[PDB]
Ligand binder design. Structure first.
Ligand SMILES: CC(C)(C)c1cccc(C(=O)NCC2(NC(=O)c3cccc4nocc34)CCCC2)c1
Ligand SMILES: CC(C)(C)c1cccc(C(=O)NCC2(NC(=O)c3cccc4nocc34)CCCC2)c1
Lengths: 236, 236
């Protein structure tokens, strides 16, 4: 149309992204030219014999950093290929927390460049001069930002035209009817779609309430949803 | 010793895990027999001609589910290979939030089995009969649980003996001294390691304070850390 999404990746390990470009939903999205994922490797932007990509930190210590020159130059080549208006994102443990709202924001960009850290990360000044936003997938210690980048790609790809609420899912049941002695809720077997709808929405709201209450803090629930939630809170 | 960690994976797309078994820190950990990652594919546990792995939900609707039989039987084969005492984890959007504390808990298990969902997920009753715990990497909509599983593997692998605080990092600086006109904080160039230590710890605490305050809510800071934080709060 062209609504195809383009995502550039800066990574020391571009072959990892096969995990999203060759498999599943994203893989089908790449096969049908709805998503293009392009990788540039800082290892290819070095000029010494040994293709060095780490550097010592000013101040000393054991924590190596990504070498500034090969990293910056990969970013620039990626910006040159994106053309005007690509948003550059540092997958960073000190970034803004990723959540579904954040995903919808990022999905509104047609060109993104993802920068994946290694070692203890990248020079602070590279954030000022090259990074537009910093995003984190959660508060845990990883060894690189590739997996966070792929998670991020997977989440945004669902907003690409041609690829196909905010609360937790209701329980799902498939065959068989009785599984190790455990039976499906009769309402789902009943065949009355209006009782099934009310139950599924009510169970969704109770799950959200019990297991992730904070997802409710930003919604104004519908009349029906407030009624079904109040019932479920009392029945508990 | 044997302290080698073993992680079984149940996935419709086992080839994705090459992204952690063939690259980086985890790849070195697999090459040196410190971590073993074994995959079983529900597609291999089917008995129809077309190797069907999805099923319709009781209650109707467009949301397909993982078919119970091939999934359950892959889990069982994985449990049989683990031997006594493997913890089975469903990577699930309705699970307990992953955070560094959670990672250290999970890293205390020598055998883990990771179950990765596809479609809208797995039968509720399979959680009662086969899943020990449910874990989520964050509040966003993905298309499968493989990437969450790999993130989880990456985080726990750092606790394997032979592979090598809780606050956000201080800013890092490497060469060059002046980068697009931006200079390194003089203290890092100074060569006095005691001033460098105090600065790095103080900047770490301010970052944590400003960008992720909630990481402070579970610590009793040291005398030095409380002093450096109070200073930084006033200087802001
Ligand atoms: C937050 C807290 C747990 C206190 C903490 C403190 C200090 C360091 C780290 C840490 O994990 N540093 C290592 C690196 N991690 C990530 O890149 C990374 C990690 C997590 C989510 C992410 N989302 O995008 C990129 C992410 C950074 C550069 C190389 C890997 C984490
Ligand atoms: C929480 C909220 C955003 C409201 C929401 C509501 C409803 C569905 C989904 C959703 O993403 N469902 C799809 C699946 N997602 C994940 O498996 C998954 C997603 C995120 C983190 C994870 N950590 O481990 C596995 C994870 C589940 C089965 C196939 C993929 C998310």
């Amino acid at each position: 149309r062209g609504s195809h999404m383009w995502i550039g990746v800066i990574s020391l390990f571009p072959e990892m992204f096969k995990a999203i470009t060759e498999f599943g939903v994203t893989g089908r999205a790449v096969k049908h030219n709805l998503l293009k994922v392009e990788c540039w490797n800082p290892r290819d932007f070095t000029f010494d014999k040994h293709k060095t990509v780490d550097d010592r930190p000013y101040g000393g210590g054991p924590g190596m950093l990504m070498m500034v020159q090969p990293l910056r130059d990969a970013i620039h080549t990626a910006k040159a290929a994106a053309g005007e208006g690509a948003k550059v994102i540092y997958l960073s443990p000190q970034g803004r927390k990723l959540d579904q709202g954040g995903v919808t924001e990022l999905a509104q960009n047609q060109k993104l460049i993802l920068v994946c850290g290694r070692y203890e990360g990248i020079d602070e000044r590279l954030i000022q001069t090259e990074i537009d936003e910093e995003w984190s997938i959660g508060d845990y210690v990883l060894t690189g930002g590739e997996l966070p980048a792929m998670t991020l790609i997977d989440a945004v790809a669902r907003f690409i035209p041609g690829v196909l609420d905010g609360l937790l899912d209701c329980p799902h049941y498939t065959r068989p009817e009785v599984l190790e002695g455990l039976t499906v809720p009769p309402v789902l077997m009943s065949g009355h779609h209006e009782e099934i709808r009310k139950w599924r929405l009510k169970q969704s709201l109770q799950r959200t309430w019990l297991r992730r209450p904070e997802l409710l803090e930003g919604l104004a629930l519908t009349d029906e949803q407030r009624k079904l939630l109040k019932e479920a809170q009392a029945e508990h």
